[model samples]
Target: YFGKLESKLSVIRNLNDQVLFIDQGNRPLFEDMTNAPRTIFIISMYKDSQRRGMAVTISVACAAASTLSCENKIISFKEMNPPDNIKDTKSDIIFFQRRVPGHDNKMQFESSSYEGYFLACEKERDLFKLILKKEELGDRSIMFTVQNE
Candidate 1:
């Protein structure tokens, strides 16, 4: 069920941000096109033979944080009701990357709220870009590396 994401690629291309696509088999494509400037998008895809459907998981990595430490890099949104925790309030938007536990390279976005689960990475990226547009907003940052579990 692989479909060419020309339209999605168009939107991604317009962002001018680095995009990496990883297949479920742990094979990386578009390696030569690496384009990490300040932010990176890691899109993982998987085909479920049982379900006969495709699942798209999206994550982001940012170079803004230098010394901050976090245990779980799976992203959560502050806009989520009540927030995931006090930490979630730090940023209106949070960007992160992590490998799915059981699904191998297939990526999924985890949210504190039910809404966050279904929120497309494309939409989240748009919101993040808008946040960057504002000059006066202060930012809290952290850096983390994703390891295969």
Candidate 2:
């Protein structure tokens, strides 16, 4: 049931480049952390909950002449056989402020692909950090406005 990735976050196009960078960095970190080449696809997904289970569909890029159609794919981690299209257009940036399901709070995952930006992280601790940072920013903005008043 995708226990490994209980939460899923889609990178907004603006952050795509950043997420990819972080994912690339994780490739080397695994050898440093656990001693293996950990391969995780920083991908975009379309979720559909059904009687069977929650299904996640991988997205494909549209040719310059055509619009992207990502509605037909649905697979599990075990069944995932990503094609060239999926590989080429990997997501690079994931904003730390965004929310993915199952995370205790909302946060974004970072790939080495994303240039030290926040990418997807496990829902345990990092999510809280993201939430607090967001609140802090909100409070600051409010304070700034009150000062103007």
Candidate 3:
């Protein structure tokens, strides 16, 4: 596919919950929009060998707009250029959108470069850290989405 979709990421419970973008010095975080406006991510679909050649690559307007890439095994943003798609590290940015077995088809994003690690957010003091988690993870923080909606 050549199109990019815009979406908002949320944690469980309330619709008020949303993902927040911060300055480059800090990690992007998950929180209650409880805000003026929520952060929006630009996602691009790509051809892959897994799950019926599906899944997407995600980026945000945060670099002035940069592609989100996994680095050091955590969710990292690449601003070496403008917030845009990258071809060199395709594996680092593509996520296999897999279904979590019995959460009623809720979805989790598996990093292509690091198998078994899923994109997850955890509360760190007053803020949440956006990172790749190895656990089913605490209380469904890693679980999300309408599955097919």
Candidate 4:
């Protein structure tokens, strides 16, 4: 789940820099929006159903049945812990996107944490917004996509 990290190069000379010298053995390691109408740029994702949603605020990240939600055009991500492996999978914040033959950049977002929950972006009165809900059979509303920023 990880790659693309840069680190300090060994400055040791060819003779001085034996593999062991720079290897550092067991300890040597390298370390690491636009919201538009008809356009939400996806950095990451989870899924939804029946038109649900998520929001942002303190206590916003609570749990009420493995759910995510919203209030007055604001977003609040519910209680979902980070993965044991930081890179294993990300949280609801960056919402990873999957194109399920789903297009218009139309992709699908199903929470790995809570499967079958897909994300929905709805046009609710001059507002292009997001929601978190479980999936419904043939419900295209739950699927999400990335608009190029």
Candidate 5:
């Protein structure tokens, strides 16, 4: 896996709804449209693990000239870094201090069952609503806890 990772991450196969970022002027990352696009999805197994120290971070991009509209929008937000705090909050509070400061900072949601799922970008204020409707991905829902300021 290390050897293969040395090479540029490339899409093994083309799949619809798959998005990749490309480097271009005025933009270093935008959806890739050319050939197969390798996608890296960042999700979590927060409650399941307690032994190994863990955290995950994901970064997501929104359409150009659409920052204000995307503010506070769940779909527009991706886990820039997976919350290690989510795993064992009692021991780890740094995650809370930095990502979401001055709050209880511990919240969680459970999926009906544990399975692989993803959140896709969409035009909505509450990204979870679109996600709960299963309009983006089927069979699974990308579960995340809600934290407020």
Candidate 6:
């Protein structure tokens, strides 16, 4: 919440798919996404988090005028070993937007656990794929989502 407010607006074109942009500041630009598939919801989460601050981002896709879909909860991990107990627990999760190679309109997720989940709008199931591929991030997923209580 302390970072400089970016001046320019990031645009992710609807292309063949209907794109809706939601954030703490912008009013819903695309209308009536109530019947939009869960795949659509997944796309919004990526775009919303990348455009707005991830700390304030929520899963508000196709709901009420101003509804945030995440349940207010946090699970803490406790370590028994001395080395594990001293690990840093305060690093922020940053959501950044990336383009799938060779496509200008399509967006991909990188930087955390969500990176494994890529967007594919053609088929419902394939629209979101979970590939266990992370270079140096082995075994564990490093992503986290934030929402207001």
Q: Which predicted model would earn the best TM-score?
A: 3
Each candidate structure's TM-score, on Cα atoms with residue i matched to residue i, is 0.24, 0.18, 0.68, 0.38, 0.26, 0.29
Q: Where does model 5 exceed 4 Å of error?
A: 1-14, 22-32, 35-57, 60-73, 78-80, 87-118, 121-149
Q: Which runs in model 6 stand beyond 4 Å of their true positions?
A: 1-7, 21-93, 111-113, 119-149
True-structure RMSD, every candidate: 15.9, 16.0, 4.8, 19.2, 14.0, 12.9
Residues 31-134, model 3: lDDT tens digits: 66543222555556664433443556666633454667787786777764222333433377777766667666466677777777777767679877677877
Cα-lDDT of candidate 6: 0.28
How do the residues 6-61 of candidate 5 rate in per-residue lDDT, one tens digit apiece?
A: 11112211122224332222211223254222133222333324322222223222
Please, what are the lDDT tens digits per residue for candidate 4 over residues 17-119? 1111111221111111101111111131222332243211111112232223332223454444322222433234323345565344445655544556655
RMSD of candidate 2 to the truth, in angstroms, is 16.0
Q: How would you encode candidate 6's per-residue C-alpha lDDT over 54-109 as one tens digit per residue?
A: 32112233343332221111111121111111122211122344444554434443
Candidate 5 global Cα RMSD = 14.0
Error of 6 at 113 (Å): 4.4
In model 5, which residue pairs have backbone atoms overlapping below 3 Å?
56-81, 56-82, 57-80, 57-81, 57-82, 58-79, 58-80, 58-81
Lowest lDDT 10-residue stretch of candidate 1: 134-143
Model 1, residue 82: what's the lDDT? Answer: 18
Q: Which residue ranges in model 4 land beyond 4 Å of their true spot?
A: 1-90, 102-104, 122-129
Candidate 3 regions with alpha-carbon error over 4 angstroms: 1-16, 23-26, 35-38, 50-53, 62-64, 80-90, 136-139, 146-149
Residue 118 error for model 4, in Å? Answer: 1.2
Q: Write the per-residue lDDT of candidate 1 for residues 44-110, one digit (tens) a residue.
A: 3433223233333333323222211111322232212211223221222322233344443333333
> Candidate 2's error at 105, in angstroms?
2.3
- lDDT for model 2: 0.22
TM-score of 3: 0.68
Q: Specify the highest-lDDT model's number.
A: 3
